[PDB]
Amino acid sequence: SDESLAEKNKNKLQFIEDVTTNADDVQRRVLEEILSRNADVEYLKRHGLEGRTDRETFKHIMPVVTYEDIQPEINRIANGDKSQVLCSNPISEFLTSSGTSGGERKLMPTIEEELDRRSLLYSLLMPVMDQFVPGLDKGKGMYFLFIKSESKTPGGLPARPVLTSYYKSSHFKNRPYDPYTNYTSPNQTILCSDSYQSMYSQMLCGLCQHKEVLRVGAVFASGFIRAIKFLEKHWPELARDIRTGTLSSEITDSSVREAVGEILKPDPKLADFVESECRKTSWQGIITRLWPNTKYVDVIVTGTMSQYIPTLDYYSNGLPLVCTMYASSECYFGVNLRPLCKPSEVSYTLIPNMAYFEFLPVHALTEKEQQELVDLVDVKLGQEYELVVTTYAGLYRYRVGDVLSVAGFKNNAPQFSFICRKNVVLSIDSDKTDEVELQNAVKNAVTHLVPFDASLSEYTSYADTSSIPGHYVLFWELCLNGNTPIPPSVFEDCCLTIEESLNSVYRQGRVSDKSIGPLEIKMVESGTFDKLMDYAISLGASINQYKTPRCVKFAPIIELLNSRVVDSYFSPKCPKWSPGHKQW
Ligand SMILES: Nc1ncnc2c1ncn2[C@@H]1O[C@H](COP(=O)(O)O)[C@@H](O)[C@H]1O
Ligand SMILES: N[C@@H](CC(=O)O)C(=O)O
């Protein structure tokens, strides 16, 4: 009912007013519920909390921790320990973060109840959007949503990404009819494990229902960009399927054929229209030509995903880019209460019911620093902080690694601009390669130069999004001391050795999802890195302190390096990758 839908949106917005006005009390309540329910868990008992639930004692007694500090407990649960180690409720599965430890996905513990809080945060998005963009219940959203590979821990618990867990749960698969969660993609196309068949069937269904589409997107800008490239490579086949009403024989999955069969019908006029738009040389504005009622593009373009804004604006002819929420494997965090703001102005209001949030000011932690972490309501405007979380699933004062800046307040709840996940230097899609992983990968690769009496004088890197999929680029300046020229096969083996030493999310991107392309090494002229040092010296840097940065994001410096390239080489094949931790 239209009236019941209006009342539901009003009650969700009233909830936002209530919890942002009473933010500190909700924060205190959440911590009290976590600490009383888990009072008898081994982790709290061994730290001497003795069933105490007050914030003051919690901050004084409990250490602020990294993943590595609690990895013994996590691995014990992963290996079959069913006792109350971190949580009183049984750990239902591990949500495998894109963030890594030892080059492997971090295993974030979860409990079945956490799905309720993920659904609560999702339930706030459309009531917020509907204030600014009315009438979205009268059509469909064309979202490209994907499941990823799954594995089992040695103790039998599933280990899978948070979104794969969510789409496979009854909270999504058997969700009730909501005209605001009415998507062009049937559940069976999303839950298809074959990524090619999932993408093809979702793109075909999106085209079949094109006039009903009022918004388009994916969780990541990179994912949506990949869907547009898929249409670029497969539109003649997709239009043929529309014209004939027969689904491509390459879609062998029976659940996908059945779901597509309910949408796909012979439509030569639509096939003519799809072909006429896709055949055009320029794909500028192709989203608004095929999906003409699209109001906005809904994709995360904050953080590293901001690198995709020009590509998205090109395909959409400048439609609004909407960043709706901020979340992780360990905890769903907040919502953008200004979804029509510019990408550079996005701030996320953390919802105080999700977890107990603390903030480390940023300008090994001392006892004073740990005890004096700033509470959610006490953060200061314009100041930067590291996010620290205490969840219902066994994380106590866990450092997420995200650096946030206070942009403003919604009643007493702060609104944060996302700055960065600490130490991440390269990212194309969900891959988050840090400086240590890259350095060690380059160090493994340069061993191939040693038999040629050659060495790597200097290097840097950048995330190249000029191709789809995007790829990592390393700039190398070589020092040759021998008489045997280095052949291209050796540089190609350097490319592959780098890839083999990068983390499992990067290798998964190459092997499983095809979300990252082959890594490239670009050899630069001699004196190129000394020319970069001359820029730094002109801007105040000393010769005795300057270090060539491991990574560069600033376009004019990438252009400078790109102008000095002598030759380039690519990894000739994918690196190795298999689901789960190698240890298992
Ligand atoms: N809206 C967002 N904007 C920027 N970065 C985000 C956003 N949502 C998630 N992330 C990043 O992704 C991390 C979670 O990755 P994962 O655990 O793989 O879901 C967060 O801690 C952030 O570093
Ligand atoms: N967290 C995201 C990305 C990833 O883990 O690779 C997902 O659940 O799909």
Side-chain angles (χ1 to χ4, degrees), residues 1-341 343-584:
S1 171
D2 288 354
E3 299 77 47
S4 79
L5 259 289
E7 177 64 19
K8 180 177 175 187
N9 290 345
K10 171 235 161 288
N11 289 327
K12 295 283 177 180
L13 296 154
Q14 185 58 48
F15 173 83
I16 292 167
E17 293 306 327
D18 293 347
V19 306
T20 57
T21 304
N22 302 296
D24 197 51
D25 280 347
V26 175
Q27 281 288 276
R28 181 172 60 182
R29 187 202 306 167
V30 164
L31 184 68
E32 285 167 343
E33 201 196 332
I34 296 161
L35 301 179
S36 62
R37 283 167 65 179
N38 303 292
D40 295 316
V41 312
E42 184 203 291
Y43 189 83
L44 298 180
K45 278 190 150 149
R46 81 181 176 80
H47 281 96
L49 193 62
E50 287 173 64
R52 292 173 291 179
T53 65
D54 62 297
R55 175 184 292 173
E56 294 64 41
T57 302
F58 180 74
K59 293 165 90 82
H60 190 289
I61 292 282
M62 296 305 294
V64 178
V65 294
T66 66
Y67 183 82
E68 293 76 28
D69 294 329
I70 60 166
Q71 196 170 16
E73 285 83 1
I74 287 155
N75 289 347
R76 274 170 56 207
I77 301 161
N79 291 327
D81 193 337
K82 297 192 201 207
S83 69
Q84 296 188 2
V85 181
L86 300 170
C87 190
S88 179
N89 286 249
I91 300 306
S92 57
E93 59 178 315
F94 280 99
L95 305 178
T96 68
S97 181
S98 55
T100 61
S101 181
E104 305 264 51
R105 289 179 170 270
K106 286 181 185 175
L107 308 174
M108 303 305 192
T110 198
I111 65 173
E112 225 74 79
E113 197 182 60
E114 283 291 278
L115 284 159
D116 293 343
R117 284 178 279 276
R118 292 187 198 105
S119 299
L120 176 67
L121 200 68
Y122 285 131
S123 81
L124 303 178
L125 313 180
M126 296 305 296
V128 167
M129 180 59 81
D130 176 73
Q131 300 170 294
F132 303 101
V133 180
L136 296 157
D137 61 315
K138 308 305 189 198
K140 283 168 173 156
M142 181 181 67
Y143 289 92
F144 293 94
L145 311 169
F146 303 103
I147 61 159
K148 290 192 184 195
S149 288
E150 172 163 343
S151 71
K152 293 270 170 176
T153 65
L157 287 180
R160 58 210 183 164
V162 55
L163 296 169
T164 294
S165 157
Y166 196 82
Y167 305 142
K168 282 180 183 191
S169 76
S170 57
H171 292 248
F172 184 78
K173 197 202 299 191
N174 307 293
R175 68 191 180 278
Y177 176 73
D178 182 356
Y180 286 119
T181 68
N182 198 356
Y183 308 135
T184 61
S185 297
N187 294 343
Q188 300 96 319
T189 68
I190 296 164
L191 303 164
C192 177
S193 55
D194 186 325
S195 74
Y196 179 83
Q197 295 190 61
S198 178
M199 185 62 96
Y200 190 98
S201 62
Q202 290 190 70
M203 184 54 73
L204 180 61
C205 291
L207 294 162
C208 292
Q209 303 164 84
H210 73 117
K211 294 180 278 182
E212 301 182 66
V213 174
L214 302 180
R215 51 193 169 125
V216 306
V219 173
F220 305 119
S222 52
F224 191 71
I225 288 307
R226 277 205 320 282
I228 305 302
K229 181 61 178 168
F230 192 90
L231 181 63
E232 189 194 307
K233 303 171 284 193
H234 300 282
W235 65 261
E237 296 161 76
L238 292 155
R240 169 208 60 200
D241 290 10
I242 292 161
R243 178 176 334 278
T244 58
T246 62
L247 176 62
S248 170
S249 66
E250 290 180 21
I251 310 299
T252 58
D253 186 315
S254 295
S255 298
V256 172
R257 299 202 127 269
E258 187 179 19
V260 168
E262 288 297 300
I263 290 160
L264 183 69
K265 300 301 212 175
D267 198 343
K269 292 187 212 180
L270 174 59
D272 288 354
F273 177 68
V274 169
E275 290 168 352
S276 71
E277 298 300 339
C278 297
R279 263 201 304 270
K280 294 173 180 176
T281 308
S282 179
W283 276 36
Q284 182 169 352
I286 200 158
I287 295 161
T288 66
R289 306 191 269 98
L290 290 174
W291 295 290
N293 301 308
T294 306
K295 298 175 181 295
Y296 58 84
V297 178
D298 183 356
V299 286
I300 289 159
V301 287
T302 45
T304 60
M305 288 293 161
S306 68
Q307 67 192 331
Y308 295 109
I309 290 158
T311 306
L312 290 156
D313 285 344
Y314 175 83
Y315 291 133
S316 84
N317 207 35
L319 280 180
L321 283 167
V322 172
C323 301
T324 59
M325 62 163 246
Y326 168 47
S328 70
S329 304
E330 62 266 39
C331 184
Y332 273 34
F333 309 126
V335 175
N336 182 1
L337 301 183
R338 293 290 178 278
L340 299 187
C341 71
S344 62
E345 310 181 314
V346 174
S347 72
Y348 298 107
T349 308
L350 301 203
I351 295 300
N353 310 71
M354 302 313 284
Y356 173 69
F357 300 120
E358 288 178 285
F359 296 88
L360 173 72
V362 316
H363 331 255
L365 309 187
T366 71
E367 167 173 275
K368 172 163 177 89
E369 286 174 326
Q370 292 180 65
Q371 301 181 332
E372 304 188 351
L373 294 189
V374 180
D375 275 83
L376 183 73
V377 302
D378 301 328
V379 298
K380 306 290 170 211
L381 188 73
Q383 293 300 297
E384 296 185 2
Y385 302 91
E386 237 191 84
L387 177 63
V388 175
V389 71
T390 296
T391 70
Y392 288 90
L395 301 180
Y396 305 94
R397 313 192 82 202
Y398 169 77
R399 297 175 73 174
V400 169
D402 294 346
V403 180
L404 299 176
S405 185
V406 184
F409 292 82
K410 167 59 169 167
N411 301 316
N412 295 310
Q415 305 185 128
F416 296 101
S417 312
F418 182 85
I419 304 307
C420 68
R421 171 55 75 86
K422 277 181 97 181
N423 307 316
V424 171
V425 296
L426 288 158
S427 173
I428 293 295
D429 177 82
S430 48
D431 53 292
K432 293 172 178 63
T433 290
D434 68 46
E435 205 164 280
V436 166
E437 278 163 358
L438 177 65
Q439 261 158 226
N440 295 343
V442 168
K443 290 185 261 192
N444 287 346
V446 303
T447 65
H448 304 329
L449 305 171
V450 171
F452 295 88
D453 305 311
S455 68
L456 185 56
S457 308
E458 295 295 335
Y459 72 97
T460 196
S461 61
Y462 83 100
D464 189 315
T465 58
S466 72
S467 63
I468 310 157
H471 75 279
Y472 293 3
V473 166
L474 269 285
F475 291 112
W476 274 17
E477 184 176 333
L478 301 170
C479 176
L480 307 173
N481 309 112
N483 312 135
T484 303
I486 299 155
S489 64
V490 170
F491 298 124
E492 286 171 346
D493 199 27
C494 289
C495 288
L496 183 58
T497 295
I498 297 174
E499 294 203 314
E500 292 291 7
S501 312
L502 294 174
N503 70 57
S504 83
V505 187
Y506 175 90
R507 301 180 276 104
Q508 182 173 6
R510 292 277 283 109
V511 174
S512 190
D513 319 316
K514 311 285 155 192
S515 54
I516 315 173
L519 181 142
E520 181 178 15
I521 295 173
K522 299 192 181 177
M523 301 309 164
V524 296
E525 285 153 37
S526 298
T528 295
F529 286 99
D530 238 87
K531 200 211 252 188
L532 262 66
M533 190 182 204
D534 291 345
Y535 276 82
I537 287 157
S538 74
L539 303 169
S542 89
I543 305 96
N544 66 358
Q545 292 171 51
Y546 176 78
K547 225 189 270 142
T548 295
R550 301 314 197 189
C551 192
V552 291
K553 298 191 297 204
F554 189 56
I557 294 297
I558 291 156
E559 180 170 24
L560 178 27
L561 288 157
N562 271 325
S563 76
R564 302 271 296 190
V565 171
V566 173
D567 244 306
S568 80
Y569 309 87
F570 292 89
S571 170
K573 63 187 239 190
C574 287
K576 296 172 195 90
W577 179 74
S578 77
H581 284 197
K582 273 208 87 201
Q583 182 259 112
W584 309 346

